[PDB]
Write a protein that binds this ligand. Structure first.
Ligand SMILES: COc1cccnc1CN1CCC[C@H](C(N)=O)C1
Ligand SMILES: [Zn+2]
Length: 139
């Protein structure tokens, strides 16, 4: 679990979005595993606008943060789960690191701000849904 809170927006994994997220929907994209909903309170986070390929992510199944080197956002095949059919997920960045399904929502940060959220993984890999291209999150 986990979310990004920026301005009057809440960014979550689309497959973990709640009934309240869908009732206050701003934008969603199944191919990215992202959903953004509106909030009444001002958020705590800020978004990176950069090309960093290193950063630190929070891993809830270890209660720890780990440093990672990750690939640039790209189209990556993701196997079927109870949430999606087997498909290509876009804007995904892969790294070597521990992750389990419940780790989705953990934030990846670089020195500039939030980069994305945990969305995929297994077998010593962890994948992050990028949010740096969503410029409207800041307006
Ligand atoms: C950290 O995520 C892990 C780890 C291990 C195994 N499965 C996942 C996530 N997995 C299941 C939920 C939907 C997700 C997706 N974006 O399609 C894929
Ligand atoms: Zn950066």
């Amino acid at each position: 679990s986990g979310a990004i809170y920026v301005g009057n927006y809440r960014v979550v994994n689309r497959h973990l979005a709640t009934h309240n997220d869908w009732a206050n929907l701003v934008w969603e994209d199944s191919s990215r595993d992202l959903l953004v909903s509106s909030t009444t309170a001002q958020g705590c986070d800020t978004i990176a606008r950069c090309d960093c390929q290193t950063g630190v992510y929070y891993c809830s199944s270890r209660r720890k943060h780990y440093p990672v080197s990750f690939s640039k956002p790209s189209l990556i095949f993701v196997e079927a789960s109870e949430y999606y059919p087997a498909r290509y997920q876009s804007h995904l960045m892969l790294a070597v690191g521990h992750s389990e399904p419940g780790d989705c929502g953990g934030i990846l940060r670089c020195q500039h701000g939030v980069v994305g959220i945990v969305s995929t993984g297994g077998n010593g890999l962890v994948g992050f849904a990028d949010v740096r291209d969503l410029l409207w999150l800041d307006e």
